């Protein structure tokens, strides 16, 4: 069973039980994809850790591996290991933006 | 200290400590805001909790609860109890959409 959610003039149809909301909201998920996002050139996993005030390198494998698993993160490794969004990441990251923008906002108060 | 997200010539300012972040990632707060934000009339606890697959009474009050604490939410009492996003509320849900959209998206594979 499904929540539909009115969307302009359709419906947004999400299984609360079965999809990778649970994955983006779980804590600094959408602080991984949005840092991935940053800069200019691939991260590795210093570069991302530090990025993220206090997110333990624990719990930054732990959302990497489930955002690989998910298409949404891919690690290359190469002489050195770094970490980048896929195309599918990088659409997650362009609808996140706004909603971390106003976060911000309300942030401020 | 903050996480600085790039988003095009701006960077965003959050602070993974202290920002309403927190409560939008934890289970349910984002179909909440979501499902609160359907229909055309002001919603009870059951229209609410009905529309959710699976979310508890327990769970959903609790949300409810932090959500009107953040402003993001408001309870009127009449004769009957109903629910709304304040203006802040559907501001987010505005920018939420888009994103599970995508997720809907993401979940078809």
Redesign the interface.
């Known amino acids: 069973?499904?929540?539909?959610?009115?969307?302009g003039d359709?419906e947004?149809?999400?299984?609360?039980?079965?999809?990778?909301?649970?994955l983006?909201?779980?804590?600094?998920?959408?602080?991984i994809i949005?840092?991935l996002?940053?800069?200019s050139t691939r991260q590795n996993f210093n570069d991302i850790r530090s990025?993220?005030?206090?997110?333990s390198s624990t719990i930054l494998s732990r959302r990497i591996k489930d955002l690989i698993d998910?298409?949404l993160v891919e690690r290359r490794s190469g002489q050195i290991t770094t970490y980048a969004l896929t195309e599918?990441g990088m659409?997650?990251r362009n609808?996140?933006?706004?909603?971390?923008?106003?976060?911000?906002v309300?942030?401020r108060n």
Chains 1, 2 share one sequence.
Do not use: F, W
């Not at 069973?1 to 969307?7: D, G, P, T």
């Not at 947004?12 to 649970?22: G, M, N």
């Not at 983006?24 to 602080?31: A, E, F, P």
């Not at 609808?95 to 911000?104: A, D, F, K, V």
């Open positions: 069973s499904n929540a539909m959610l009115r969307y359709t947004i149809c999400i299984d609360p039980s079965e999809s990778v909301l649970h983006l909201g779980k804590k600094y998920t959408m602080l949005s840092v996002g940053n800069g990025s993220i005030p206090g997110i998910s298409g599918k659409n997650v609808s996140l933006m706004p909603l971390l923008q106003y976060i911000s309300l942030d």
